[model samples]
Target: RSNTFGIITDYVSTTPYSVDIVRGIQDWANANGKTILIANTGGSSEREVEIWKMFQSHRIDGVLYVTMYRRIVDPESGDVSIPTVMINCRPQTRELLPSIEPDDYQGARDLTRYLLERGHRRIGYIRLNPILLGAELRLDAFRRTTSEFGLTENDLSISLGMDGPVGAENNYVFAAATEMLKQDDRPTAIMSGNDEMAIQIYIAAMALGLRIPQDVSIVGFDDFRTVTMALKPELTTAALPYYDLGREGAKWLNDLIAGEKIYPGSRVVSCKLVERSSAAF
Candidate 1:
């Protein structure tokens, strides 16, 4: 019948930023005379099965699977036999589906190099929990970039945050920022795990009567609008490219249904650094 695709994601409505993907797909799907059915699993694999079968029963043309914040596309409730493309997600180890995940590794390197070029010799990084995959990869990027610059250990510092629990993480970030800012040898510039954590840094700096750029420059990732736009000066961050991922996913699906030859494996899209006053003052 007419083209119709199915989108299965953990949860998009709850995560406002992730909505960009829906917008992207709809933009392309509608333009091409195609429609899409979206299902929010709320992170439940059980619900996913029902949804998957519904798509199959409806005889949709393809499948576009997305994972929130980029993670492995876990076991499907049922098998997907249609043309499939993963967005901000990785296929299961045994699976060979194509994906488009943000290049956070390159993003971290770019951000590190950005700071280094801007005269931040003593840069400090407040990294996320090391056990997490993306977190570690980002840290590795930071380490690699600094090394590539031939910077010494004294020129860099690091503070790690825990992913233990939600509320505790905020508490952890607040305390860490407070302590870091109070240090006599604190880094001239601080790069947080992401924009939300960077907001905590702003809160801590305000409490200590420290002016953002004048007292200590700051940088972050995930150019999350909810946090960046609301700050006194907008935050400088590496954008996760949610909208781009969505657009690319939809375009890829179009190519697939049109019988275009597609290569296997993942497509790692680059994260853009949104330069703002936060990084310069």
Candidate 2:
């Protein structure tokens, strides 16, 4: 009855990153003795809307909408009387729902500052093409850090934006890293938008007979376990607060459904930089 809640995500359940967030929500539901109905919309907006309507018909107490990587305008969730929350994305909705997301800017700033402290003046960045809000925020932070350190145009290279297509991880990595290293004044270190790209960069470096953290250093976002741990030298990357996003989001929805006076603003969870052997002085 009122103890039942619903969760709709844009990704499949097999995605480890998305699964971790769902796990957090499930844990909370278990503690409260509540039931949760979960669904994956496969990035279909129409599908998401249909799922929400179905949940509404079920008389669920609350709903949690989990977004893909980018933040976009969301369909109105005010039709149903039940409280609704957003996870991992700050949606620009007609009827704004409270959101829980990571602090992308801060995480990027911290990682950039760390490289600077290690005397890495010539740093390069590999950004994603068709950049989304998360990458934009991170790039802003990177720019701010470099400007504060008085880095000139030659000090940083963010020209290679189109790494490659979505599934072909190594293609873009090889293309970008090879292009960067071939320069006369190459960067002492490189920072990628995510861990997958960083791994590719590692392979690219090896192809050029370059040693990581010896010839050059590398850092990345999204401390993906499989990539971070599997690399010869563990990668230095930012840990996105996926679990906290789920837990806090569910808690907020619960409070709202319980008639508690909860604030309507978005809650941003900070990310942590996991230092490892990949990026060192």
lDDT of 2 by residue, 102-167 (tens): 898999999999999998999999885444678778888999989988997668988554534333
> Candidate 1 — which residues are off by over 4 angstroms?
74-77, 129-132, 165-171
lDDT of 1 by residue, 129-231 (tens): 6544677788889988999998876777788755653223434777888888788887888889888788888898889998888878898888888989988
lDDT scores in order: 0.81, 0.80
Candidate achieving the largest lDDT: 1
RMSD of each: 2.2, 2.3
RMSD to the native, candidate 2? 2.3
